[PDB]
């Protein structure tokens, strides 16, 4: 809709680096602890990307000190601050859910390297 869309691009952020599923990403979060407005990091591979304009959002899986944690992220959310790609993976499927039932050597993805 003319209404909605004009209204949409109002909040849609611009400086979003392009990336594809399977690309290892570093994400910075505006986490706040009462007063301490910190900028915590979070690095896991991207396993799915949703492109719905202002509602676009991706998700990353990180195997940290224990077991897997799948955290989605509203792309244009102010809570996320920075997005740096670290390694561009070479997969050939939009959604990588199948990573869930595998771990370690059984998991490691390829490298795209162009």
């Amino acid at each position: 809709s003319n209404i909605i869309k004009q209204l949409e691009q109002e909040q849609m952020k611009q400086d979003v680096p392009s990336f594809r599923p399977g690309d290892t990403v570093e994400v910075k979060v505006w986490v706040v602890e009462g007063s301490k407005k910190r900028l915590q990091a979070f690095e896991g591979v991207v396993i799915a990307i949703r492109n719905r304009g202002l509602h676009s959002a991706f998700t990353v899986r990180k195997i940290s000190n224990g077991e897997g944690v799948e955290r989605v992220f509203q792309t244009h959310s102010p809570v996320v601050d920075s997005i740096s790609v670290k390694r561009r993976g070479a997969v050939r499927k939009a959604k990588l859910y199948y990573l869930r039932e595998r771990t370690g050597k059984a998991a490691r993805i390829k490298e795209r390297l162009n």
């Binding site: 940290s64 000190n65 224990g66 077991e67 944690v69 955290r71 989605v72 509203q74 959310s77």
Partner: protein
């Protein structure tokens, strides 16, 4: 998304391995327990010489759910297993000492400063 009969995992060296949720606490006819909830659990699998033993019935708080949680932004944090922290069946005060895995920011309610003081993540 924990409820009765759910079979969780212990998030600390408390003395057990695997447990079972026999009762959600708080409110009549409560259906589900999530990250910040206290549940009555029995013990289904103890560690040979732990501080507890198979067949005990004590309160516990879950810390991770496969169902995940939701923040004021719309994001969610789905873990890969259902994990809980044991408590004394009389006065909460976590039993174990060291806690494995991360937990969540939505657990600080002042009566768990012991917990978040131990969490190695989030």
């Amino acid at each position: 998304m924990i409820q009765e009969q759910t079979m969780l995992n212990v998030a600390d060296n408390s003395g057990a391995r695997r447990v079972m949720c026999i009762k959600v606490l708080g409110g009549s006819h409560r259906r589900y327990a999530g990250v910040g909830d206290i549940i009555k659990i029995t013990i289904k699998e103890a560690i040979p010489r732990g501080k507890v033993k198979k067949g005990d019935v004590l309160k516990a708080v879950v810390v991770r759910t496969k169902k995940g949680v939701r923040r004021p932004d719309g994001s969610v944090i789905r873990f890969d297993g259902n994990a809980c922290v044991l408590l004394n069946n009389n006065s909460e005060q976590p039993i174990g000492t060291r806690i494995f895995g991360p937990v969540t920011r939505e657990l600080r309610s002042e009566k768990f400063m012991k917990i978040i003081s131990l969490a190695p993540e989030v």
